[PDB]
Amino acid sequence: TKGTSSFGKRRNKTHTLCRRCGSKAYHLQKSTCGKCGYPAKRKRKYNWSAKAKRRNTTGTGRMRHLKIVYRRFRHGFREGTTPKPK
Amino acid sequence: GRKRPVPKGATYGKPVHHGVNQLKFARSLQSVAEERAGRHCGALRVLNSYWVGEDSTYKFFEVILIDPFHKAIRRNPDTQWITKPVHKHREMRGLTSAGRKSRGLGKGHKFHHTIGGSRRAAWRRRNTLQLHRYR
Amino acid sequence: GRVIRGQRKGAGSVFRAHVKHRKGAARLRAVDFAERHGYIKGIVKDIIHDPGRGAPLAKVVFRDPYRFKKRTELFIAAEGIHTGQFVYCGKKAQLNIGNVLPVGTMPEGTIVCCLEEKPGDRGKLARASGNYATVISHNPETKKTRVKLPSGSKKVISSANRAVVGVVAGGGRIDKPILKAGRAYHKYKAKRNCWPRVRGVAMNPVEHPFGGGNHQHIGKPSTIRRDAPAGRKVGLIAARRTGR
RNA sequence: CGCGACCUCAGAUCAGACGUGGCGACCCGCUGAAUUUAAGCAUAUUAGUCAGCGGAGGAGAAGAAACUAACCAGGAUUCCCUCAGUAACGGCGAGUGAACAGGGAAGAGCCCAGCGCCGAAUCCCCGCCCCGCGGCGGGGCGCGGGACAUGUGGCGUACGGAA
RNA sequence: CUAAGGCUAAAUACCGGCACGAGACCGAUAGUCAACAAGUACCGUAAGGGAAAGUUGAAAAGAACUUUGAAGAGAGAGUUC
RNA sequence: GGUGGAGCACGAGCGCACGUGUUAGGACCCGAAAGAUGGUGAACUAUGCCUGGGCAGGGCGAAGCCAGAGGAAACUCUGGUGGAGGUCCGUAGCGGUCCUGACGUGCAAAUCGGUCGUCCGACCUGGGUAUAGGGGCGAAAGACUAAUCGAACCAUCUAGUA
RNA sequence: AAGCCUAGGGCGCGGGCCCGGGUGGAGCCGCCGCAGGUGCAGAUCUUGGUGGUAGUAGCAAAUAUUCAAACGAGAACUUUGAAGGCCGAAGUGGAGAAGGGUUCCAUGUGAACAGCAGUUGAACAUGGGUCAGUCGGUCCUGAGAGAUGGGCGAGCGCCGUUCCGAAGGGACGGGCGAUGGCCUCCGUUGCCCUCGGCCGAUCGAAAGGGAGUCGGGUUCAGAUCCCCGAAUCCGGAGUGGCGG
RNA sequence: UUCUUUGUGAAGGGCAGGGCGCCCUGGAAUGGGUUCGCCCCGAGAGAGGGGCCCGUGCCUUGGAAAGCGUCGCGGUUCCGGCGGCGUCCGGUGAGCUCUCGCUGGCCCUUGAAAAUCCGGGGGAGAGGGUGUAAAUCUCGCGCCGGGCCGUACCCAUAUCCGCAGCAGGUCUCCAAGGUGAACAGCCUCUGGCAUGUUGGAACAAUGUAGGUAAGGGAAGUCGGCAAGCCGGAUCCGUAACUU
RNA sequence: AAUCCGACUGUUUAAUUAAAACAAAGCAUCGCGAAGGCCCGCGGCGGGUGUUGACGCGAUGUGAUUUCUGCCCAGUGCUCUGAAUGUCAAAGUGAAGAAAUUCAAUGAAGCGCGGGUAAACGGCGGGAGUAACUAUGACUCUCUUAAGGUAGCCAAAUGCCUCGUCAUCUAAUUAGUGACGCGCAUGAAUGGAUGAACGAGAUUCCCACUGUCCCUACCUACUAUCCAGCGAAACCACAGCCAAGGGAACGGGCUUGGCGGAAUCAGCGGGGAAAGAAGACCCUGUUGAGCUUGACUCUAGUCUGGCACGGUGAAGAGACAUGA
RNA sequence: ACGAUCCUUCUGACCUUUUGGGUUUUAAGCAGGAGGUGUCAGAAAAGUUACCACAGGGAUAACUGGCUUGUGGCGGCCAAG
RNA sequence: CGACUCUUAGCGGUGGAUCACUCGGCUCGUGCGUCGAUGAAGAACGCAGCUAGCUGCGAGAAUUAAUGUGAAUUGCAGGACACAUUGAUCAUCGACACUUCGAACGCACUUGCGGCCCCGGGUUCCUCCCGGGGCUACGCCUGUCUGAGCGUCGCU
RNA sequence: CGCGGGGUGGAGCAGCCUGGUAGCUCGUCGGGCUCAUAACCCGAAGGCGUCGGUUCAAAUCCGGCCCCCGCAACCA
Ligand SMILES: [Zn+2]
Structure with missing residues (x-):
């Protein structure tokens, strides 16, 4: 009765949506993540999984702030100046 | 010393690595005092430390810390070198005197290692096989 | 080989004590001026039953001689303790059943229980269900006292510690056998997982x-x-030895 | 039975700043094996390598001898060639294995404590005036405060230095 | 030579990122897993695993309109070399 | 005068390129039982704790109690009441003995039919929680640990060696 | 042009090669040397496609369907009416918790799925639908988890929940001073005197504790939630809004 | 004559009806009172008289206006209509379920914490002087507000987990009538459905699931395996052994 | 009506073994008075037992009741004391040398030595003499290593010979039951003998009962048959009629003969050395894994000694030395 | 009638080095002998698996089949009885 | 002749092999070499007239402002603009803005509870209530303030 | 490999640390005792593992060898 009849009593869950990595890996009982390690200050990463490092790296997401830094870098980091008006 | 952080036995392998009691930590204990001072106070930077007493169970050290952003050091030409971001956490990288002695670096035949950049760089040059264009 | 059982009992988390329904720790009073020089009077309000323990507990209420409150204690009841009986506590207290007083002061040969091993830890020895301690002799110099423990070993202890006079109520518990696995199953269920x-x-x-x-x-x-x-x-x- | 200094130790939604985390190809400091070989295997080898931890930078580290040499002597550190698969290590087995010198790329030296001498001659912060302020600076005015004699600043560091 | 104090660019490394250049390299079962809405769909509770999938035509000019069938589907007609 | 040497006895090497053969490197290609490092799992199951829920109808008839009779007290019999049970038949529930039935590319990677054990306490079960791999847990079968257990799974060493 | 097909013509022992025809529409070949990821029949090879088996096994667990009408092009399976049945209140019923997440309701389609069919569906395309002081969560704590102090650890961090701790920021009354509204009064905040513990931050149950809503009606799909009508609980009130 | 229907919420008041280990008089053996059982009594029994709690039961405001069952009309309809009436009297039962209360038995099992609320001991303090105040664990009435999230549907032989519309598994509420000890098995009512991934035609073998067999009764088979016998209730009767 | 086992209720290998297996109340031990016993933890003034205190905690063996539990400490363990002292490391001390170095004394714990313990692991034989037939031995002596199986029990779940011998059960019994013991190799908490109740436990016999059979036969439902519709999968070098011969030692193909005729349907299990799975039974590998110990190296833990944290005072005592 | 490398021990030279020069102790060498590898051209090495696994082998057993018939069974020839 | 079966050829089906293309990868080389409490990386949720996915953007949400350029975007409508006007679209981008979680920062993650000030409705502060804004995390440096000590001292 | 100890009539124990007699039991030949047996008491054999030396003189104190076990030890 360890097979099909044992799959029927799977009602409660152990993991939910994490609020730092977004993946369904936040363990309810231990009150911790482990795709990213939410209660730990540092993001969980490991070098023995090279594919998992590139799944969520710097180049993956939106660059909602960093692409401006790259764009401002070639322009000279000027502030407070405006182009000469007509 | 340093007891090996493994359970009761559980040192699976060849009989060389079965020792856990009589193991000595490669870095000096005084450098550990510098390491812990900067770990707790990440805003300041350690210059050096010195010995102020010991017990059979404890060793006491006094570590000098420098405010990088205080205007007394920041405007002093002799001491504003530490304000540079190159010297960020010298205690972590073994740049103080207590950490410099643990690296085994120096001049002459007495060492014959650390002859590149550091001990790791000395191992690198002797192990990278140089293949030219023409060989 | 894997870790044997018993060796696994040191880590716990399955073998820890079942302290949910227990009513507290069975300790004596703390030392102070009234206990060291005179006596203080307490009232036994009611007697309760501690799960996982073979001896009843006597709920003795004292009044604090410093600030206006009533202090509740957890005394192990001697055999003969009834509700409303005045219980005295101190050096000047008289000698009867249910009266804790220092070991250096009563004459030797008395029957005492809930014996204090070190002076100021509120009683440790001879307090299980019906055991008792007997005093052999005293010693005025160095303030030592020889007391016979229920195991048969005689220990020389200080004369400044105390015990309550009498035997522990609930003797003869092991006289009646269990007669069932279920009554044995229920006996250790209140204590800890160690029966099967x-x-x-x-x-x-x-x-x-x-x-x-x-x-x-x-x-x-x-x-x-x-x-x-x-x-x-x-x-x-x-x-x-191994045999009879 | 208090007041007033000093030393140690606190509380601040005190005034003003600072660190956390990420990336991590290169680097630094630790910790750190077993596959594999030795036709087995335990020293050895894999290897101070994989993994784990911390730390920054655009480079890092190292760096101006408690050096190499025994020469008619060279002279910080870093990288290439060569020494060299050499001296040496190794159940002297498998295998491991540098360094000096020489030719080059580059080449830059210095600062403290102490010893001393100068009236603390020094430094930090708050208020006012002038200048410019979108990498908060320069000058002047303040019995305006603080740090400092349990030592700040100038001369001065082994190539001698000071008077 | 002068240790038990400290600073110091250059010759050095760079499979990450930005912007490029080049190739006796592979040409859609090859080349990065991914030439395409690819770390996407999907699988496992989770750590993680992880695809397949390029091509009308110069230009849609993508078949107006007649007829059978309810329609899918046809016969004609028409466009394009 | 004998003897050992990879020697001299009027050079023949250096550089480049190709082929053959050997060795080390993944080494002509594919293939293990293994070992180590770091992480993920008690939603199945194993056990403990906390908080809740449930377990028809009958059989036997313990203590205690009442009445009567017999007697010399001692006391003893008879008829009632009573409802005790790790009691019994038996339903729901829990589980799976036998037919080694059905099926056995099945309804199903373990189900179905009849016949079964128990069914008031060592009973069953929901939710929360704790114990994590040479570890856990085990009324003890090397059982269970997410269809995997005489050492789980995931990734790396690793294209491990043969 | 490449590529592909060929009952055509042939060459070379052979590896293979040259022409003829057809499709095709845009690049390709010979010689001298150079270089390689260079030649397949197998590896219980990998990927993809297709056969015999084969229109075969099969569409048989739980008693059962029949007649007439409607829609339509089409009816064994849809709907309606009638008959006969079954589940038999520990149900094939009426409602929930976990889980599912639009699957709930109306209209339309029948391209693909519902291992036959379907005018039908939990399929598809359009839209719509969940209304709370009183129902729950929110609050409390249990088993337990988990910071600060403390200790350990090379280290990410680990141990532990009262243990090596200056762990209270609260409150009554009085004094000093001030503002606020008709500084008479009340109110506000700062300091001083005074009092003071309680066992420790915090999390932890939609089945534990937990104050207080019921009746009728209403929608295609929501109703102790919407409307109607009756109540009830908590908090506030300075000038107290009124009476007793 | 057979079937359906025949009633009143929450919130308050009153009265039934239960419970008291609450009180006053009085003091009892010739012992008394009393339950299924118990049990109680000079530490106060009976007998009288009172007091308190629950009152979910009845009546009352709600509240007959509304709801329901019939009959007849209005609006073509679009309408939450308009009227006539009724919604009555009683008794039972070891009846089933729920709830309240009392009592008894068992434990080497004694059967949770906290939030929150309430009562009491005290008198630190307050107010007013002969018409008024401070007070009102708020006596009655009155005003304002109660903020955030879920609320649809399934909850299982088709909406969950098993690769699926899978005979598997999954925690709970209610439970009609008859027969019958029974919430057992069978039939019927309310409610639900089309027989469970299809139908038609024949009734071959071999099958799966049910049955029956003259005579023998285990001779079959490793083996009474399977199948079969008895079976409920009432009246008798009941052995060896034994803790 | 009996035999064996387990007392019993209960639990156990989910997915081949529900039991005689585990557990269980009872019985008998061991350690521990808290700076302790057992154990966890890399670590800490850490943690579980412990909100605990010998009627407790932790580790054991046996398995209800009744009765009994005999002998053996030689062996391996465990434990006790001990200057009666063989061995014994580091550190310290003395001597020699220019010094590294060497030698000597001292020399802890533990091993040895000496006691205890078998409800600790365990074991419980011969030989020889010996009673008025023989036989046998009530009795006496010896080892190997310490005694040599006591009470009881059985051809058992334990007996190779074996289907041991006798009685019963049957017409017939390698089965069962009841006795004998010489027992390859029964046996006393590795528990022995019993034993009321009970067991989805393992066997023998009797009554009733029946298709288990003699000996099969008939009926019903759903399949299987055909048809409407939809429709796979395993497997497949090629395919498929045999006798003999040889072959690689058993042919569908080769040879010699027999001979053979489209396409099929429903059964059927003779073959296709049928399919399902690189046999797990055996062996090899200088391939592993689990477990054990008297295997070889180690190690956690634990005991002992020294150094440092480690201060103060007073006596005594051992050696050396001075030395009559 | 007996034993390679490495290691150790001993013996010998007015023997070499002991790495800046000199002396001594010590140590490393050169040559010879010995301390042994009996698996004897020389690893340092106890078991069990019925809980087992992997790569293979018909180079190799446990069936049948194939050769032979020791043995078993069967049938003969001579003839002392 | 038939029906069935085999080979070959033509044609028509299943299938997407070969060939030629390629806004893509791999390798090497050069320059620079820049994250974040003024809130990084990442994640969640929203934003177009008709918008599912990709990309872009953040309640100013298919982009705002400015500079350069100069008649378009476009799948379909629409309407701005006169391109004789900073003017449609694009690139640059130096100004402004940037929801929630997240080192994540008032306490914990249920999106629930807090407190201290200011402002507007309540009110004409007189306390509730509502809405908006600014604060309230840890570690640590300098300085300030208030303190503690049978620490060392003087005054008394 | 270096610290120890012990070998004894036909058989089991001393005498050894300190040299002066090889002894004590048990088996054997006998003698006594009691009326006799049994028991008991007595006389007799037959021997310091081996070599050498110090010494008035050895089993004894010494050194070396054959047979054992106590330990601690281990790179051809
Ligand atoms: Zn996460």
């Missing part, structure tokens, strides 16, 4: 040093030395 003891011979040899073989036999001397490691100190631990 599987003998090590029938167990497989990876869980026990005595298991294995085609016959249910030990195969090795069951008397094991005192300095044996964990997982090997199993059986007769440093036995001086």
Whole structure:
């Protein structure tokens, strides 16, 4: 009765949506993540999984702030100046 | 010393690595005092430390810390070198005197290692096989 | 081999005490001026039953001689303690059943229980269900006292500690046998998970040093030395003799 | 039985700043094996390598001898060639294995404590005036405060230095 | 030579990122897993695993309109070399 | 005068390129039982704790109690009441003995039919929680640990060696 | 042009090669040397496609369907009416918790799925639908988890929940001073005197504790939630809004 | 004559009806009172008289206006209509379920914490002087507000987990009538459905699931395996052994 | 009506073994008075037992009741004391040398030595003499290593010979039951003998009962048959009629003969050395894994000694030395 | 009638080095002998698996089949009885 | 002749092999070499007239402002603009803005509870209530303030 | 490999640390005792593992060898 009849009593869950990595890996009982390690200050990463490092790296997401830094870098980091008006 | 952080036995392998009691930590204990001072106070930077007493169970050290952003050091030409971001956490990288002695670096035949950049760089040059264009 | 049982009891989390329904710790009063020089009077309000313990507890209420409150204590009831009986506590208190007073002061030969081992830790010795301690002799110099413990060993202790006079109520508990597995199952259910003891011979040899073989036999001397490691100190631990 | 200094130790939604985390190809400091070989295997080898931890930078580290040499002597550190698969290590087995010198790329030296001498001659912060302020600076005015004699600043560091 | 104090660019490394250049390299079962809405769909509770999938035509000019069938589907007609 | 040497006895090497053969490197290609490092799992199951829920109808008839009779007290019999049970038949529930039935590319990677054990306490079960791999847990079968257990799974060493 | 097909013509022992015809529409070949990821029949080879088996096994667990009408092009399976049945209140019923997440309701389609069919569906395309002081969560704590102090650890961090701790920021009354509204009064905040513990931050149950809503009606799909009508609980009130 | 229907919420008041280990008089053996059982009594029994709690039961405001069952009309309809009436009297039962209360038995099992609320001991303090105040664990009435999230549907032989519309598994509420000890099995009512991934035609073998067999009764088979016998209730009767 | 086992209720290998297995109340031990016993933890003034204190905690063996539990400490363990002292490391001390170095004394714990313990692991034989037939031995002596199986029990779940011998059960019994013991190799908490109740436990016999059979036969439902519709999968070098011969030692193909005729349907299990799975029974590998110990190296833990944290005072005592 | 490398021990030279020069102790060498590898051209090495696994082998057993018939069974020839 | 079966050829089906293309990868080389409490990386949720996915953007949400350029975007409608006007679209981008979680920062993650000030409705502060804004995390440096000590001292 | 100890009539124990007699039991030949047996008491054999030396003189104190076990030890 360890097979099909044992799959029927799977009602409660152990993991939910994490609020730092977004993946369904936040363990309810231990009150911790482990795709990213939410209660730990540092993001969980490991070098023995090279594919998992590139799944969520710097180049993956939106660059909602960093692409401006790259764009401002070639322009000279000027502030407070405006182009000469007509 | 340093007891090996493994359970009761559980040192699976060849009989060389079965020792856990009589193991000595490669870095000096005084450098550990510098390491812990900067770990707790990440805003300041350690210059050096010195010995102020010991017990059979404890060793006491006094570590000098420098405010990088205080205007007394920041405007002093002799001491504003530490304000540079190159010297960020010298205690972590073994740049103080207590950490410099643990690296085994120096001049002459007495060492014959650390002859590149550091001990790791000395191992690198002797192990990278140089293949030219023409060989 | 894997970790044997008993060795697993040191980590806990399955073998910890069931302290949910227990009503507190059975301790004496703390030392102060009134207890050291005179006596203080308490009232036994009611007697309760502590789960996992074979002795009833007497709920004794004292008044604090410093600030206006009533202090509730957890006294182990002596045999003969009833509700509303005045219980005295101190050096000047008289000698009767249910009256704690220092060991250096009563004449030797009394019957005391809930004996204090070190002066100021509120009673440790001879307080299980019906055991008691007897005093052999006193010593005015060095303030020592020889007291016979229920195990039969005589220990020379200080004369400044105290015990409550009498025997522990609830004697003869082991006189009636259990007669069932269920009454034994319910007995240790209040205490801890240690009742279903599987003998090590029938167990497989990876869980026990005595298991294995085609016959249910030990195969090795069951008397094991005192300095044996964990997982090997199993059986007769440093036995001086083995027979009758 | 208090007041007033000093030393140690606190509370601040005190005034003003600072660190956390990420990336991590290169680097630094630790910790750190077993596959594999030795036709087995335990020293050895894999290997101070994989993994784990911390730390920054655009480079890092190292760096101006408690050096190499025994020469008619060279002279910080870093990288290439060569020494060299050499001296040496190794159940002297498998295998491991540098360094000096020489030719080059580059080449830059210095600062403290102490010893001393100068009236603390020094430094930090708050208020006012002038200048420019979108990498908060320069000058002047303040019995305006603080740090400092349990030592700040100038001369001065082994190539001698000071008077 | 002068240790038990400290600073110091250059010759050095760079499979990450930005912007490029080049190729006796592979040409859609090859080349990065991914030439395409690819770390996407999907699988496992989770750590993680992880695809397949390029091509109308110069230009849609993508078949107006007649007829059978309810329609899918046809016969004609028409466009394009 | 004998003897050992990879020697001299009027050079023949250096550089480049190709082929053959050997060795080390993944080494002509594919293939293990293994070992180590770091992480993920008690939603199945194993056990403990906390908080809740449930377990028809009958059989036997313990203590205690009442009445009567017999007697010399001692006391003893008879008829009632009573409802005790790790009691019994038996339903729901829990589980799976036998037919080694059905099926056995099945309804199903373990189900179905009849016949079964128990069914008031060592009973069953929901939710929360704790114990994590040479570890846990085990009324003990090397059982269970997410269809995997005489050492789980995931990734790396690793294209491990043969 | 490449590529592909060929009952055509042939060459070379052979590896293979040259022409003829057809499709095709855009690049390709010979010689001298150079270089390689260079030649397949197998590896219980990998990927993809297709056969015999084969229109075969099969569409058989739980008693059962029949007649007439409607829609339509089409009816054994849809709907309606009638008959006969079954589940038999520990149900094939009426409602929930976990889980599912639009699957709930109306209209339309029948391209693909519902291992036959379907005018039908939990399929598809359009839209719509969940209304709370009183129902729950929110609050409390249990088993337990988990910071600060403390200790350990090379280290990410680990141990532990009262243990090596200056762990209260609260409150009554009085004094000093001030503002606020008709500084008479009340109110506000700062300091001083005074009092003071309680066992420790915090999390932890939609089945534990937990104040207080019921009746009728209403929608295609929501109703102790919307409307109607009756109540009830908590908090506030300075000038107290009124009476007793 | 057979079937359906025949009633009143929450919130308050009153009265039934239960419970008291609550009180006053009085003091009892010739012992008394009393339950299924118990049990109680000079530490106060009976007998009288009172007091308190639950009152979910009845009546009352709600509240007959509304709801329901019939009959007849209005609006073509679009309408939450308009009227006539009725919604009555009683008794039972070891009846089934729920709830309240009393009592008894068992434990080497004694059967949770906290938030929050309430009562009491005290008198630190307050107010007013002969018409008024401070007070009102708020006596009655009155005003304002109660903020955030879920609320649809399934909850299982088709909406969950098993690769699926899978005979598997999954925690709970209610439970009609008859027969019958029974919430057992069978039939019927309310409610639900089309027989469970299809139908038609024949009734071959071999099958799966049910049955029956003259005579023998285990001779079959490793083996009474399977199948079969008895079976409920009432009246008798009941052995060896034994803790 | 009996035999065996387990007392019993209960639990156990989810997915081949529900039991005689585990557990269980009872019985008998061992350690521990808290700076302790057992154990966890890399670590800490850490943690579980412990909100605990010998009627307790932790580790054991046996398995209800009744009765009994005999002998053996030689061996391996465990434990006790001990200057009665063989061995014994580091550190310290003395001597020699220019010094590294060497030698000597001292020399802890533990091993040895000496006691205890078998409800610790365990074991419980011969030989020889010996009673008025023989036989046998009530009795006496010896070892190997310490005694040599006591009470009881059985051809058992334990007996190779074996289907041991006798009685019963049957017409017939390698089965069962009841006795004998010489027992390859029964046996006393590795528990022996019993034993009321009970067991989805393992066997023998009797009554009733029946298709288990003699000996099969008939009926019903759903399949299987055909048809409407939809419709796979395993497997497949090629395919498929045999006798003999040889072959690689058993042919569908080769040879010699027999001979053979489209396409099929429903059964059927003779073959296709049928399919399902690189046999797990055996062996090899200088391939592993689990477990054990008297295997070889180690190690956690634990005991002992020294150094440092480690201060103060007073006596005594051992050696050396001075030395009559 | 007996034993390679490495290691150790001993013996010998007015023997070499002991790495800046000199002396001594010590140590490393050169040559010879010995301390042994009996698996004897020389690893340092106890068992069990019925809980087992992997790569293979018909180079190799446990069936049948194939050769032979020791043995078993069967049938003969001579003839002392 | 038939029906069935085999080979070959033509044609028509299943299938997407070969060939030629390629806004893509791999390798090497050069320059620079820049994250974040003024809130990084990442994640969640929203934003177009008709918008599912990709990309872009953040309640100013298919982009705002400015500079350069100069008649378009476009799948379909629409309407701005006169391109004789900073003017449609694009690139640059130096100004402004940037929801929630997240080192994540008032306490914990249920999106629930807090407190201290200011402002507007309540009110004409007199306390509730509502809405908006600014604060309230840890570690640590300098300085300030208030303190503690049978620490060392003087005054008394 | 270096610290120890012990070998004894036909058989089991001393005498050894300190040299002066090889002894004590048990088996054997006998003698006594009691009326006799039994028991008991007595006389007799037959021997310091081996070599050498110090010494008035050895089993004894010494050194070396054959047979054992106590330990601690281990790179051809
Ligand atoms: Zn996460």
